[PDB]
Symmetry: D2
Subunit: 268 residues, 4 copies
């Protein structure tokens, strides 16, 4: 009856109840999956969030820049799900770009050290999670990451755009590796959803030129989307991720599914 009945799925990237990952975890549980959750840094605060999910799920610590956490991750997961059991799904819902690389800060003023950190967390980590977790994934399994279409430049998103372009490229290579295990790798390119991350970008630009341009982006998304776009509601995005975690897109890999109201298909 549930789309993900019987599946064991790791979900990274819960930080608040608004997190795309929170809604992915919620719909997944609603659809019969057994979750393992990972969180970064503020674990006590994240546990308060995860308590509001429909079911209990273990929360493991994962800083994707921490080599020890990556090296121990498989064993920690196996310990949570029981020896002899493997994962069927992995969700990377993780991003970061130091403030110099996003927002009102001029593009040319982001030092490489900041850019490099953002690319580590937002792009390279997709590879390093796959490297850690493919060895405990079942054939038929699915790795999904989150993307924002970086095909064209835009105001404010700046070096995160560059990180997403790298992420898309990384995904195409992770698919080559994943396929050796019978595993798909794909991204969901979402339209804008009011998360802590989105709020940070918007809020940090209020009152500035970039904020005027972000306003235009926000207005235009729903306008261009043939079926509309509601920026409050992560459910449609979460459902799409669940579709890729299911067995119903079995010939799709190294690819990008756009959960954006169809906006990217319309010039206006």
């Amino acid at each position: 009856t549930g789309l993900l009945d019987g599946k064991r799925i790791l979900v990274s990237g819960i930080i608040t109840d608004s997190s795309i990952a929170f809604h992915i975890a919620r719909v997944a549980q609603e659809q019969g999956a057994q979750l393992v959750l990972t969180g970064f840094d503020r674990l006590r605060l994240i546990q308060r969030i995860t308590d509001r999910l429909p079911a209990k799920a273990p929360l493991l610590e994962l800083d994707v820049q921490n080599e020890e956490h990556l090296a121990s991750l498989a064993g920690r997961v196996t310990e949570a799900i029981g020896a002899g059991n493997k994962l069927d799904g992995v969700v990377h819902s993780i991003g970061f770009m130091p403030q110099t690389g996003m927002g009102i800060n001029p593009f040319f003023d982001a030092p490489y050290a900041d850019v490099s950190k953002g690319i580590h967390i937002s792009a390279y980590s997709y590879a390093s999670m796959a490297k850690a977790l493919l060895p405990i994934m079942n054939p038929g399994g699915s790795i999904v990451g989150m993307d924002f279409d970086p095909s064209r430049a835009m105001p404010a998103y700046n070096w995160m755009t560059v990180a997403k372009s790298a992420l898309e490229s990384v995904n195409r290579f992770v698919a080559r590796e994943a396929g050796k295990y019978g595993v798909r790798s794909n991204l969901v390119a979402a339209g804008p959803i009011r998360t802590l991350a989105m709020s940070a970008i918007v809020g940090g630009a209020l009152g500035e030129e970039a904020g005027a341009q972000i306003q235009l982006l926000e207005e235009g998304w729903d306008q261009r989307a043939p079926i509309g776009w509601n920026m409050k509601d992560a459910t449609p995005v979460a459902k799409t991720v669940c579709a890729l975690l299911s067995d119903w897109l079995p010939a799709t890999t190294g690819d990008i599914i756009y959960a954006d109201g169809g906006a990217h298909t319309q010039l206006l």
Copy 2:
């Protein structure tokens, strides 16, 4: 329990048991849908095929070049499904290109009259089916057509490539109209499957230069696909169509989902 439990879905394009449409219809029925089927020209022969589906379904006549059949289609469907009921899904699985526009015939030697017929049936008909059927579609509904990625030229496919490029463009406009009804429109770009149509192209090129090149295309698809590609098996394609007919890709429209083993994401 079924992905399409309760849904009423029209499926065009069954000609043999190998038809992508046959497998779409089969998986849809397996997943709890109630079908209405359309067939072109050889209706007595098609009925012998549809008898082998898991359940009985009415077969209506539809030649997409026939204006009377298009004008009467909604009423004929409503009569099959019962007054007061509407469709939730529509599958366009239809193509044709006169032999001068595909295969070994030189590209420049296809007269426009032949090209125009192929584009009518393979591209424009996506619009005219949508125009006929949106008025009897429920909000939440889904229109899916079948595509073969025409982003790059290739041997033999010739003017059908041109028809598919037009089809992708048509789909983006059908989505604008469909969205007024709460309806999604999308294509599934499939990898090669041995259907009557594919056999016709391959067979018509055996022993010729183009056949050597088609051989390379066939070999290369499974090689490039990170998860492989089996040209016998339409099931993975049919499942993808069913995914788009479901409620699990609710923010995707005017778009293309690639059910091709990930081949299009890999240069080699």
Copy 3:
């Protein structure tokens, strides 16, 4: 000293002094080319226009839907340029879509007969001009057509969008044929320029919903273009065409060069 010194170039599509073709012809002549011009239907009126070019050039009649004109074209050109001489360049700057397929007329209300005419003139003719003219083209030669980026749907452009999508596909196949003669084939995707054609679309939508949307398209082009966009000035487009007619893009074929101020590379 001139980019096209010594080259013989056919230029189709002059109808008014504002025609993209007029400016292509003008810059080409400025750059040392010897032109042969083709015109459709209103030849006496077109001659009044071509008299304003910097040099005299013969004007031949070509209706691309007329099979006799296509069959006689090579011989007529050879007669204009002298036996023993061939063309180095061909410019297709031709488009048409019956009024039912563009503007305020609903997308679904364009009958196929109208759509088919538009695709004949706007897309298939690129192939049929190449078929007629490659036999009198020198190795090193160049065929260029005019495109408007149809990657995404948009208001009003409607079935012309579909014709342009087909044109891009046709160009990729013309390149395969052209390469047998040492000849490149490419499109220039221009931003909007106030021509008779553009005026017709804009004017036919004044006072209607579509006209409000065209206004947004016009405003947005210059805004998104990092170097700006001036819709009066065809020169930048004409220069780009001349670049492809030159020897300075010798490894580019089956491709699209965007002369649009960079707009297509920017979401906003």
Copy 4:
């Protein structure tokens, strides 16, 4: 008479006589430009190369990871070209990826520190060269970088593919900044040319599985290219760069011109 008569152009990336930059510099000089050259690390060896250019040109030191070299670059250039003179063109022809990120080394085994270095030199440096040099560029000017189409994954190129995907994204943002100065920014996506860099990749894979796959890539390029592809000959690529440095692509920015024999437009 020369395409670049009167223009002052900086050209980075000469390491051997086979360097794409060497041929860019050579054709540019042939076409009347005045060059300033930058080299990395092996300056005495590079000077032996640059002595073989058609004219003398000053060679400045630039390690793009060195912040002092970047901070002093404009002043050093101005000193070479004379106070009161500015650049009209800048060529970034620079790449590097530590050996763990390219070749036979498994994709997942490249540590981020190596990946980060490759992205610094191959992608971020496009921004930091633009940031250093736009302040001494004339309106009408042109910045060009070198790309290898990273739209699809492939054997061996691995993390350099990821760097190129980031580079394309960076270019789209550099165009927004450059446009404030009346300056275009674009990449040329070249087909494969036997340079020190290409030889390193090919040579490092000889005798291994990846080398078999590179062989297929090499064979397939000329096959798919409608006009062919000669991997010895950088001239066609160099000419394309010169086209973008000229005034003949005046409405193209944030974009990519493919100097690849048209291969990327053909599936096979």
